[PDB]
Amino acid sequence: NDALFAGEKSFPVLAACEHFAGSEKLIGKAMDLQVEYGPVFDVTCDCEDGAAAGQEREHAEMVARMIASDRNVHGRAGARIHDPSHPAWRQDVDIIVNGAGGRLAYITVPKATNSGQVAEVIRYIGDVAKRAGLDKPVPVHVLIETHGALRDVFQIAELPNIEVLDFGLMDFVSGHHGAIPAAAMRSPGQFEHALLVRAKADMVAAALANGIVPAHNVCLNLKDAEVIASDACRARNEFGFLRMWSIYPAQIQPIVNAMRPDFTEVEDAAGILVAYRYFWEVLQKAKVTGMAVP
Amino acid sequence: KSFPVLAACEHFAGSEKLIGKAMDLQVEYGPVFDVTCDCEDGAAAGQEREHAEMVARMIASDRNVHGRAGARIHDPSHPAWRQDVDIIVNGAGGRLAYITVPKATNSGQVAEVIRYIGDVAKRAGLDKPVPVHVLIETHGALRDVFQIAELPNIEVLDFGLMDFVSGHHGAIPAAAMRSPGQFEHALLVRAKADMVAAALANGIVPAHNVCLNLKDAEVIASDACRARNEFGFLRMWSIYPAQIQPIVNAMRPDFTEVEDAAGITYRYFWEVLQKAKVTGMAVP
Amino acid sequence: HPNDALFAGEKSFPVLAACEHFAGSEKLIGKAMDLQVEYGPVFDVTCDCEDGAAAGQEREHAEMVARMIASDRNVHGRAGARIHDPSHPAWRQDVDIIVNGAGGRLAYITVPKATNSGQVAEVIRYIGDVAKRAGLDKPVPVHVLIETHGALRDVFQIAELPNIEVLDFGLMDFVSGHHGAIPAAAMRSPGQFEHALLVRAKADMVAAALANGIVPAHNVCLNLKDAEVIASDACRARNEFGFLRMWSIYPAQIQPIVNAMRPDFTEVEDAAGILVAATYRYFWEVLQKAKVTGMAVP
Ligand SMILES: [Cl-]
Ligand SMILES: [Cl-]
Ligand SMILES: [Cl-]
Ligand SMILES: [Cl-]
Ligand SMILES: [Cl-]
Secondary structure (H helix, E strand, O other): OOOOOOOOOOOOOOOOEEEEEHHHHHHHHHHHHHHHHHOOOEEEEOOOOOOOOHHHHHHHHHHHHHHHHOOOOOOOOEOOOOOOOOOOOOOOHHHHHHHOOOOOOOOOEEOOOOHHHHHHHHHHHHHHHHHOOOOOOEEEEEEOOOHHHHHHHHOOOOOOOOOEEEEHHHHHHHHHOOOOOOHHHHHHHHHHOOHHHHHHHHHHHHHHHOOOOOEEEEOOOOHHHHHHHHHHHHHHHOOOOEEEEOOHHHHHHHHHHHOOOOOOHHHHOOOOOHHOHHEEEEEHHHHOOOOOOO | OOOOOOOOOOEEEEOHHHHHHHHHHHHHHOEEEEEEHHHHHHHOOOOOOHHHHHHHHHHOOOOOOOOOEEEEOOOOOOOHHHHHHHHHOOOOOOOOOOOEEEEOHHHHHHHHHHHHHHHHHHHHHOOOOEEEEEEEEHHHHHOOOOOOOOOEEEEEEEEOHHHHHOOOOOOOOHHHHHOOOHOOOOHHHHHHHHHHHHHHHHOOEEEEOOOOOOOOOHHHHHHHHHHHHHOOOOOOEEOHHHHHHHHHHHHOOHHHHHHHHOOOOOOHHHHHHHHHHHHHOOOO | HHHHHHHOOOOOOOOOOEEEEOOOHHHHHHHHHHHHHHHOEEEEEEEEEOOOOOOOOOHHHHHHHHHHHOOOOOOOOOOEEEEOOOOOOOOHHHHHHHHHHHOOOOOOOOEEOOOOOHHHHHHHHHHHHHHOOOOOOOOOOOEEEOHHHHHHHHHHHHHHOOOOEEEEEEOHHHHHHOOOOOOOOHOOOOHOOOOOOHHHHHHHHHHHHHHHHEEEEEOOOOOOOOOOHHHHHHHHHHHHHOOEEEEEHHHHHHHHHHHHHHHOOOHHHHHHHHHOOOHHHHHHHHHHHHOOOOOOOO
């Protein structure tokens, strides 16, 4: 099915959910939850929020060790590095790429203010990956959470090895000199404010135009499954997001289930393929979201 | 530059039988709608020259009374698109109203097809260039919509909802391919509004995709009204004859508006009077 | 030690009045300047040349505008002028007369109907030349109308041009360029906040303005005296689109626009507290917004 439709770039088949963990304890717990739930979600080892004042070297070292370890069973653990303006972002790249033991799933690049910063970070990851003897390039996840990154979203989406564009609602709103009220940083405002609709739709349009998965910001409700599912459904059905971040384990199953294809849709997709392109995407989405494939 | 005064409706017909019937319906109704002879959906699997040769003959024939018959050729990646242009431009007897270009994935493909149409039209001894209708129905064509709208001889930008949605790796649900979703989904609002903004910025008519309801006049009228009054579309495609009159009437200027337009800023009122004529209304 | 000198790695966001009142005659300019004395500089005054000036009275009208702006009547120095568009034969003459005449009190120049980035850049460069020759130390701030297809297409390029402090949304002229595709009903509320082309245009301009530390300003309310309707338009522009200013064409529109644009009383109380103990750039913007909108600063 893959060898029969390939004149074009293959769309990445990625988990509907990306769970964040900053500490060794929470990274381990998340990796263990992947064993429990199946790789229905990816784990991002956070450096940007996780690393302390002057503990950047120690923290990236722990992250690299955690990703390289036997604890990382499914190899679906990536890392969020510091932003391109932070002096430790290169050091994070170097420590994690050289130390990850080739198990590094991706690198998440936050707070870039333009296409140039992203290109520089991807170029650097590539140089470090080459220098480490890595065969395949390290996939990159790029945050779109600044004015410049949104303005340059179509240029960013054309950069090499990007598999995800992440919408950063909080940092995006903070840059608007108080023109976007706080109420718009919560639902339903985040799907209705003209600037946020514009930003989300531009990001998704740029991502999908370039075979990139568009990923949605977290739900601020940590434990109410119905509220988490509602945000994931609005993001999936009204904007075209195919992935969503998680900051609390209770958020994973509602995100995965909201992003899942219909049971009858996958049944039909397998039958048609028993013999297209669309139905193959549906069957691949069903496997990645932990559903039974016929 | 004068804005193009085009019929509010564009009816599609793939077979000789349906092309003929559509041309006869233009005689019945008046040229309130254009006819697009469809080589893209209409042509058989490997009978592209035979079909193009039928289309050219139908457009050149006496049966085409109002000279408001264009053709939709194959997409720029299809091996028969140049052959469709060769056969239809050289064979149309100079009656060819326009060429509809579908599924272009970038500005380059559109420019190439326009350039080729121009070359064939010049060699065929055509005085005026063949007007072009460009489908915006891919990621690349939407990304490049402002660049496409600046290309020469384009008089229409057509929104291709179905092919546009199909390229979204299932991110746009099936419910959005129909009303009210096709006018409310953030990606579809964005795509439609970008296309209309690009078209109107360059004196091009923005045209809307078909209504999937073939015979219910109220549902067809509703789609044509939303596309006209919420998005700025000035034309809409038809795939069934029963869709023509609801589309034309939904796009018509207000009776009092035309009465005031005749009693004559002036470029606007002139556009209204010309719209009233093209839409088969009584001009005072 | 001051809040302004403590944050300078970036450009400071302009602290402008929530309202901009237009007046085209000497009488109405006078009255608007007097109303700034009565209300406080909670609103700016734009001396309209563009609409104000008669058939061949462009020089005479710009001379009156310059005289009014330079006069003792202009107490708060919050009086700008709208010159003619870049295609108009009097725009340079308006700049010459008003800049050389304003006695250094000119608050800004409003540039209308530009059809591209190049026209805007040309007008700004010309204002700069005249400002420097008139002995002005600081450049004359510019307000640019986004009311054409070309200016909307080039909005991000326009927003990068020097000395722009406001991007104005010109609904009426923007709609008139759409060959009747935007109906008249969309030129009023709720259509002007809901028509796909208008949402797109307004959101693009606000996004371009805010991306470049420029204040996005909203078009007038066509209801001249109903405070509830004026407040409603100011609130939709403020809370759904991110506009931080709005035009006024009738004095009764000023207070509803200012009040709709005001920060919450508790928000300013907190902003003063955080800043005294001293994110801070946000709370500083809120405290400055409170002063410019005539609220009591703690
Ligand atoms: Cl750009
Ligand atoms: Cl299942
Ligand atoms: Cl369609
Ligand atoms: Cl005078
Ligand atoms: Cl206006």
